[PDB]
Amino acid sequence: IFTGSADIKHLLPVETQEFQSISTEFLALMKKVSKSPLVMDVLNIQGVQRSLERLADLLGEIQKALGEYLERERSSFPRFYFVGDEDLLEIIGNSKNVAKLQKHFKKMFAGVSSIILNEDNSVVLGISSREGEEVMFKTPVSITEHPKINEWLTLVEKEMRVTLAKLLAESVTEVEIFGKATSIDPNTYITWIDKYQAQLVVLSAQIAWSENVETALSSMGGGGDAAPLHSVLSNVEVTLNVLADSVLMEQPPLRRRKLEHLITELVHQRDVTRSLIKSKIDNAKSFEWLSQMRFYFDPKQTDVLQQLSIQMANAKFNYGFEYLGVQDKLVQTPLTDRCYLTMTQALEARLGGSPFGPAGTGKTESVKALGHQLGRFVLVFNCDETFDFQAMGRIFVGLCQVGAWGCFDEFNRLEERMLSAVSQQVQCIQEALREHSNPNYDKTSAPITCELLNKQVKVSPDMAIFITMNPGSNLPDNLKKLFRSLAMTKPDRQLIAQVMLYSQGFRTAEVLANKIVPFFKLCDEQLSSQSHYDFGLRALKSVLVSAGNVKRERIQKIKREKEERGEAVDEGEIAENLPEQEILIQSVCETMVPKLVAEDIPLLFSLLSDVFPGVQYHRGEMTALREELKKVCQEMYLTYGDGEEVGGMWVEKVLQLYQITQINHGLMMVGPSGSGKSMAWRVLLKALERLEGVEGVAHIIDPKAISKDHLYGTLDPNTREWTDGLFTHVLRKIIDSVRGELQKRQWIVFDGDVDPEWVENLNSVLDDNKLLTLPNGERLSLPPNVRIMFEVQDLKYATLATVSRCGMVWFSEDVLSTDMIFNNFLARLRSIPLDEGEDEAQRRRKGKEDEGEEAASPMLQIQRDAATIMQPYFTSNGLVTKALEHAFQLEHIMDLTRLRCLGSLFSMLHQACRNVAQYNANHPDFPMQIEQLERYIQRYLVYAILWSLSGDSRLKMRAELGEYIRRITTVPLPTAPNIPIIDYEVSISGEWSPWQAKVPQIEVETHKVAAPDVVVPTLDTVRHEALLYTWLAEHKPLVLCGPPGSGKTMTLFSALRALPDMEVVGLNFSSATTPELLLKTFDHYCEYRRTPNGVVLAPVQLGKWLVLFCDEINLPDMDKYGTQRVISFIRQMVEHGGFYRTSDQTWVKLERIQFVGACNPPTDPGRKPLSHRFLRHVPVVYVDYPGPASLTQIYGTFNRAMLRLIPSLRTYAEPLTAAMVEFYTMSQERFTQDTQPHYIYSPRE
């Protein structure tokens, strides 16, 4: 406190001097301790105990003095009780730096977001709201004459109230003319609306209507003549017509809000006057008029807090002239009228209020509206894991002292300790309030008090407390007697929709409201329940506002179209002849369909057709963007369609993504894995690059791979220095714009699972504030160029707070058909040389078509011919499609995803054409003929189909798939009866050949009979190393699963070490393994080198491919939100080809790094399933047990080695080896894990 602020010296000089003399002594003592940090040496310091007791006493005294001073400052200006200790110290310390105070007014005042100041900051001229609405003081507050912060802040509050009352007087005086006029000139009415604030405008309208109705009812006076009320209704309807005409025009936003508020108030006034006329009310003291809220303005009152009196039945409140800004008004439904009546009755009886009901029924908003109608500062306290208790006593004292309301939203959600403590505090406050009501207590001298924070706090009468509740339930037993409860079970959807649609200028609102309201409930019931769906009233109101915006856009479109021609223009005439239902259904579809799952979209359209018959939503045509999408899709080897074609849904989804990016500043793609969301976003960025001539930059971050501290940057607990996190570093880089980043357009994409923990800081940015706040105290303003994006497989663990702020496009799995992926594969084959690597990757963009480069290499020709051979089998009903559909029926240990199988198959076909190229290189005198090429690739396609689809399944199911392929295929297969098709290899020549020919029979030394880590060649081993080489040629991350002891680790190590280039690093994963293990391994074997392209991680050994063995990929523990950190880290490495150095907060790229894993099946207890965004990249093989033939071969080799010691028993080698196998197999058949958990057998035995 005493060095952070330099002005504290002037406020508290004596305490400053005492703290100086204390700090010197304490520093000396700490130096002495530092020179001898032993406990016993410290204890023997001369007089340490008495010195420390003196220091404790004096520090306690100075802290007491500081607390008393801050409490005095709080009591001088009571609104500071809503401000924390550090914030109040900042406010007082920066008394001369007024700009720093500007951020704290939103906590103290209801609407004042800042204070307008003279250029020298010596006089306060007025106040301003969040929306920019300003109230200019009639008499400015001179800071120079009142230098103390509390004094001129109190004067600012006083002048706010005085000027609001004085402007309300003029507003009422001006609107009285419109009240008594048969016709209202629209220009004068709009000028009056502009001249005065929204709050005073609505108050003036209400005051005029109340006074006119009062004068009318006085004039009728028992004669039964209803003409004056008819005149009042006529004037109200004339004003409504004027406002309806004015709101269809194009208006500034503030004036539009004022017009909307006036319409919402005047509809209620019209309804009340119609009710009075229908009931034939003929006396001002009849209850039908008294039960309606009434406004009595007495300009002659000298005091400015008892001029406007708001009355409802018994209750007679005064308007506290607290500036509220442009608040959101509430459609005064009969339920809200009941709420107002009961709540004002409770306030008149000094009881508390308890509107209880289901969620989203307007309870807290109705209480807020009631408090704002009377001008009293409302302060809603949320009760969902953000309940700041340590300020709650301070907040209660502030409410009591200043006079202000407090509403607890969902008070049930407080935990039992929290509930009981707050219940006791509110009970004491309510008893203090109820003490007012007694008549014997004369209020000439009545200082009411309550026991709060062990002090007697004076309670003002204007204060009140409200407790919203959610049944299922009852209020705490302390407050059951003191609180009046009201059942807000079911709000009036129809009338709210009616009033809002009428406010937007719709000619027909009754029919539209009565249609749209049941439609939303129909969608809520019929559609499959999902977390992201939101058919509550907030969504409905937002949809109706969007419909109004679309209507106004159509008016402007027709107006400008006619103006470019020769025509006479009138806004009302254009608005008359339009379909309102088309606008409303368009808004509903545009707001809902992006969120809709593919299963639910036809149900939604059926419901929409039912509710809105004969009305259809034609999608707005974007010709330019669609042409750019076509260009980029052909450039990136992607299919494009014009809707209802192959790829129409994907084009529609990227268009919806463009729409949501245009609307919102934050959005998500929440499809399943392998639906094209990341590809769609990339295509959209590269298409807007051409369309708008603005450079698209992407910053892709995996948030769960990196820790939150590194992500957002952490403050050093000592030796204060700020280290920017990765996200904060990116934001600061774009904000500074050293390389002109403001000119460019940049999108940040959080490509990883969303969790509550790492999105707390991002909530402020994603909200309308658009401000990142850090523990450093810096406030980064998000510029308009930034668009924070999300990719998630699902939002299972995403908070509703995060989902609400962001737009969303659900990329259902049936947006990317199999035909699209096959077309992508065949297009990549025909134009990407398969051997040239990455040096020619840049040259792909040099040529827009690469003319004259058809024969880039013989590899291109060979793979083009291979694609020609392979095209008939990749059709929409070809061999591959039927095989995949059948394979999806088969159970696999790992979850069978479409793109995993397809990527495996594509890699195998890549290796097929590579093998053809190898044969051509080895036969330069006569290369591969097209007949041999046809036979070879036809057989290889079947072989790869088997090993990609049934490569994860048992041997019996591999045989099943082989039988199905044999049924449906035209390619010849092996003609040996009792051999599975998987046992055969495809030779370089087209004909098949058994694998058994390629497995040698070796002899093992007696030295290493049981530890030949070089695997004895068996049929499974040769198959699996062949597949290992095929899938390592493409650098795909191989994974092998199987039961324990099957032999996956040995086969992996032997196959990897057989290669000359591969440098194996053996890492074993555990439950506590993290990204830190992989980073440490890279630091060990690899190194970072700077290049013009960027920072590159590479192995130290040149020309060697570093491959990481992850022996147990499954075993790392999932977080609380079901994600393995290391798996996501490996996923981002293999998919993006790099990762972010957190220390430097910079992107680095892997150059010669690979991953190859082993696993047990996820059914085993210690294991977990892998993320589907990760399993897509890895091809998984199932290493089952060797079986009788392989075991006989392996242990024939071992026993022939073992019997070499004794030369008379060599002849008994083979008979023994069968026995060791046979009995073992018999045991494996007789004893299973079902009988006992430990009856497990493997070749380890």
Binding site: F287, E288, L290, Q345, A487, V511, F519, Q526, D610, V611
Partner: protein
């Protein structure tokens, strides 16, 4: 059965008011039975024929076994003097628990006055009260004084601390500690275990309720001018009685048990005082017309008592009561507080004007109160008793085998075997296609079949495991052991409840409803498979047998809208009750069965008030028609259609025409309704 058929005098017994005293001899005996044998046989017969009298019959069984005066001592005023003097030790606190809204400290004060013993009373409502109570107890434990702590349920943790303190003391002989509380579950279990519990309840009746209300109100408040005020208070008191006693007869009296407590009464009195002070302005008299009746009706309909009411139908009932009572005609000497009491008699307003006249009129009321005082039908009492009757037997089922541990698995094996045999083995899933998915009915029935099949597999697996445990094949796991604990006692396990059902249901009713629901699901699935979705319209669906019949109503509305190309908003519902066999259904008409009509009989599609508890509605045609601009006829009543007898969930509402010139308000006071299932 044959004896019942042959008995000519059976009907007079069956309609008798006290059948239990004269049960006929029907059981066959090889030897003459003992008196207790006759008692238990009569108990079985009364359970079979007249369950509403079962409790009374049960009392006779007790009188047949444990003496006539056995139960009588409880039907008496509580004699706390001898009990606290002799049967209570000084260290055992006297816990006086009361139902909410009732205070029992007056009993302790009266006892302290009678015994001439100084008593210190402290109200625990704040942290200070704990210190005062500790000081008072530390003084009295040494000096042997009497201590009373009022409303201690507000402090559970401090009550635990007090129990721990009490375990360590060495109190004086004359020391006594009374703790008055309201019955809540937050009181510590150990304190209840280590204390003498006395349960206090208010005496049921309108008479006692009005007497308590008049005693609670100060005399000066009612005696204040103008003279009319007291009469209003009487009406208010009567009103507060009528709503309160009616809560006994829930779900018939009210849709749910609201907390109409004394706070509402004080708020109403304050409202009346404020409005009469405003209107009279000190006049000694004001005419009955000048009383602001509209203000009182609106405020006690929306602010005082209506705030707690969430159901719209209970709000309508409250409006009917307030409009019937609070009116100028209340000041006429001929006003009737309750019409057709017992169907023949009426209750007249007192003709006095002072408080004493009304108090005397209340004191002179008859002691014999029927439901007709509150507007309910007399057989409502016959309903309430049989509910309590079931509440007896089920409670005894929760006592049958936790005390008794001898054979319980021998019978549970047979019970679970029968339950497995009852439930069908499987529920075939519907075959979704492109054509039938457009049908809303197929979507609804597919969702229903999915939920039913899942829950069916759950229950079948649980029962199979239970039978395996009873045979010794399977060991008792924790979940399984809890399941046997629930099933043996007849409690419905939480693991089985995944659709809305009545609370407190035994397991046999649940599995029987299960069998009916699954049979309905099988029938509709077979119909869909055979004739496609087109047969889903012509099938007569029991809304009771659906897990969410509101979805069925919405689906029928959607089907009519799709067929006739009308908007959903423009369709309105009408009901036709047809007794004719083979009544053809129109294209917009859907059949329903299993509906029950509580409190009325439907003849010629017209309602008439009836004394029958429930009447089975025949095939009911729900017809959707374009909403014509038809004026709401005065002879039209908007009944609800509740899901089941608890009336917790409302499916929709039905407009019915009234056969006679009966007031529609009588249907609201009578609580007439419709239930999808009994």
């Amino acid at each position: 059965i044959a004896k019942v058929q042959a008995d000519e005098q059976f009907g007079i017994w069956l309609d008798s008011s006290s059948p239990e005293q004269t049960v006929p001899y029907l059981w066959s005996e090889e030897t003459p039975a003992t008196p207790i044998g006759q008692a238990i046989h009569r108990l079985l017969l009364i359970q079979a024929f007249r369950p509403d009298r079962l409790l009374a019959m049960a009392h006779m069984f007790v009188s047949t076994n444990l003496g006539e005066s056995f139960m009588s001592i409880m039907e008496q005023p509580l004699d706390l003097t001898h009990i606290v003097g002799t049967e209570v030790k000084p260290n055992t606190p006297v816990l006086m628990c009361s139902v909410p809204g009732y205070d029992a400290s007056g009993h302790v004060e009266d006892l302290a006055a009678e015994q001439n013993t100084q008593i210190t009373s402290i109200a625990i409502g704040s942290a200070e009260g704990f210190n005062q109570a500790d000081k008072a107890i530390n003084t009295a434990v040494k000096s042997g004084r009497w201590v009373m702590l009022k409303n201690v349920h507000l402090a559970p943790g401090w009550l635990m601390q007090l129990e721990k303190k009490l375990h360590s003391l060495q109190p004086h002989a004359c020391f006594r500690l009374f703790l008055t509380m309201e019955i809540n579950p937050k009181v510590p279990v150990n304190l209840l275990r280590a204390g003498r519990i006395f349960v206090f309840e208010p005496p049921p009746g309108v008479k006692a309720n009005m007497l308590r209300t008049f005693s609670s109100i100060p005399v000066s408040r009612i005696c204040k001018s103008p003279n009319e005020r007291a009469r209003l208070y009487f009406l208010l008191a009567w009103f507060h009685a009528i709503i309160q006693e009616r809560l006994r007869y829930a779900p018939l009296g009210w849709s749910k048990k609201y907390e109409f407590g004394e706070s509402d009464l004080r708020s109403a009195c304050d409202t009346v005082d404020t409005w009469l002070d405003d209107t009279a302005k000190g006049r000694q008299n004001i005419s009955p017309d000048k009383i602001p009746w509209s203000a009182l009706k609106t405020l006690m309909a929306q602010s005082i008592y209506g705030g707690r009411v969430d159901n719209e139908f209970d709000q309508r009932l409250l409006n009917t009561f307030l409009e019937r009572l609070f009116t100028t005609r209340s000041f006429d000497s001929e006003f009737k507080l309750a019409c057709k009491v017992d169907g023949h008699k009426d209750i007249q307003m007192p003709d006095g004007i002072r408080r004493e006249e009304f108090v005397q009129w209340v004191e002179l009321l008859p002691d014999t109160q029927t439901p007709s005082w509150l507007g309910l039908p007399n057989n409502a009492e016959r309903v309430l008793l049989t509910t309590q009757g079931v509440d007896m037997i089920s409670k005894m089922l929760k006592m049958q085998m936790l005390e008794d541990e001898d054979a319980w698995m021998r019978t549970l094996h047979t019970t679970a075997s029968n339950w497995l045999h009852l439930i069908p083995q499987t529920l075939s899933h519907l075959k979704r296609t492109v054509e039938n998915i457009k049908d809303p009915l197929f979507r609804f029935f597919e969702r229903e079949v999915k939920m039913g099949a899942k829950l069916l597999q759950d229950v079948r697996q649980d029962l199979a495991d239970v039978v395996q445990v009873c045979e010794g094949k399977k060991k008792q796991t924790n979940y399984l052991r809890t399941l046997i604990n629930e099933l043996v006692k007849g409690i419905l396990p939480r693991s089985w409840s995944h659709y809305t059902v009545p609370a407190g249901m035994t397991v046999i009713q649940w599995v029987s409803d299960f069998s009916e629901r699954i049979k309905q699901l099988q029938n509709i699935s077979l119909a869909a498979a055979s004739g496609g979705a087109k047969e889903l319209k012509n099938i007569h669906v029991c809304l009771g047998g659906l897990f969410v019949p509101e979805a069925y109503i919405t689906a029928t509305r959607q089907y009519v809208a799709q067929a006739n190309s009308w908007s959903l908003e423009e369709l309105c519902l009408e009901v036709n009750v047809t007794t004719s066999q083979g009544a053809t259904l129109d294209a917009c008409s859907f059949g329903v069965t299993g509906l029950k009509l509580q409190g009325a009989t439907c003849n010629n599609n017209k309602l008439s008030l009836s004394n029958a508890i429930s009447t089975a509605l025949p095939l009911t045609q729900l017809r959707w028609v374009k909403q014509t601009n038809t004026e709401k006829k005065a002879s039209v009543v908007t009944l609800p259609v509740y899901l089941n007898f608890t009336r917790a969930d409302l499916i929709f509402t039905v407009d019915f025409e009234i056969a006679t010139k009966e007031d529609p308000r009588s249907f609201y006071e009578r609580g007439v309704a419709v239930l999808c299932t009994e």
